[PDB]
Amino acid sequence: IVGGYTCGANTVPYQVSLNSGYHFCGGSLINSQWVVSAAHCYKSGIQVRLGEDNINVVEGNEQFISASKSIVHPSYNSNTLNNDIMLIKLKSAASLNSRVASISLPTSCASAGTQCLISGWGNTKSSGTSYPDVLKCLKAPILSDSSCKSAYPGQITSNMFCAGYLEGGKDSCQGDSGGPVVCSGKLQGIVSWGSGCAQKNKPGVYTKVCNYVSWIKQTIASN
């Protein structure tokens, strides 16, 4: 997250870190056994770290649980990042009598202008690289379709939306992929891609979760 602020420990209790040799992607807990992330985060040997704040120091509230299944959307297109969504099943249920909790799925798609919370342990520099120890947060509005399409001609599908600032300076960044965009307590987006980070006229592009609610619920029920 570039241009954000330190969230504070467990103030984003549904945030997870996906760790496979290192932290490499975020995700969002949607019930005690399932995490939503980005399809492009797929890889072997994922451990899900819940209740995390400082990724390098165990200090309380962390739960480290191996993924048992990673189910990429059947229409994911790795060339265009269309349908960039994946569900991860935990090998054991997380304990929610705790700091950890799930995030609700959307009941409708959010509107342009709506302010959302985006969070992650990704790079905090708008050029160069610096990965933070503790979880970062950013408040950012959903941008209009037209401004999104103007920033990313030919590349924005109905399963994507832009959020952030056309003036740049504030954005998600490498290491944030798969993590949450939450708007009024609903999971509306998954960090997916962008041209660089925090650049002028290049806001973040996010998977539009409201298009996938039935796929998510059916996948959870059948796995």
């Binding site: 290192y22 490499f24 980005a38 985060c41 265009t80 290491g175 891609w193 041209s195």
Partner: peptide
């Protein structure tokens, strides 16, 4: 723009990035 989109992805795994870039050549 295969290589461009490999860098556009917001993960931080060198292995995933290098895999993406190599696969663009194949």
């Amino acid at each position: 723009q295969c290589k461009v989109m490999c860098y556009a992805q917001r993960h931080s795994s060198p292995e995933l990035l290098r895999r993406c870039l190599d696969n663009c050549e194949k």
